[PDB]
Amino acid sequence: EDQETAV
Amino acid sequence: PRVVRIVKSESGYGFNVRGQVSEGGQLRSINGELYAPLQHVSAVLPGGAADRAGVRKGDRILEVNGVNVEGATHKQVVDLIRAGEKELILTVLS
């Protein structure tokens, strides 16, 4: 269970 | 391990971070050393701040702003990245 976020 | 300073620009820091949402996990060997799970850089915007600072896709994020993030949740790492208004210091494993 991964998540990806643009910063 | 290498330390990179990134200055937020009009496109933000210009990278994506990806990794586990939970806390902890099993140790993994990276370059002969053991670490708990690391978030990683899943995208780098060409010409953005991270690119210009030398961050590359696949870099594993070991520290954010001097804080070790082994086993950290995705939220913890995103929050640390967002801690500064302009400056970000990453320690990465390429």
Swiss-Prot record, chain B:
Residues 3-94 form the PDZ domain. Isoform 1 is predominantly expressed in the testis, whereas isoform 2 is predominant in various brain regions, including, neocortex, paleocortex, striatum, hippocampus, cerebellum and brain stem. Expressed in cells of hematopoietic origin. It comes from the Eukaryota. It is found in: Early endosome membrane; Cytoplasm, Cytosol. The modification Phosphoserine is found at S11, S22. Changing Y13L: Abolishes interaction with KCNJ9. Core component of the SNX27-retromer, a multiprotein complex composed of SNX27, the WASH complex and the retromer complex. Interacts (via PDZ domain) with a number of target transmembrane proteins (via PDZ-binding motif): ABCC4, ADRB2, ARHGEF7, GRIA1, GRIA2, GRIN1, GRIN2A GRIN2C, KCNJ6, KCNJ9 and SLC2A1/GLUT1. Interacts (via the FERM-like regions) with the WASH complex. Interacts with SNX1. Interacts with CYTIP. Interacts with DGKZ. Interacts with MCC. Interacts (via PDZ domains) with SLC9A3; directs SLC9A3 membrane insertion from early endosomes to the plasma membrane. The PDZ domain mediates binding to a subset of proteins containing a PDZ-binding motif at the C-terminus: the specificity for PDZ-binding motif is provided by the 2 residues located upstream of the canonical PDZ-binding motif. The PDZ domain also mediates binding to the retromer complex via direct interaction with VPS26 (VPS26A or VPS26B). Involved in the retrograde transport from endosome to plasma membrane, a trafficking pathway that promotes the recycling of internalized transmembrane proteins. Following internalization, endocytosed transmembrane proteins are delivered to early endosomes and recycled to the plasma membrane instead of being degraded in lysosomes. This is Sorting nexin-27. It comes from Rattus norvegicus. The gene is Snx27. The chain holds residues 39 to 132 of 539 of the full protein.
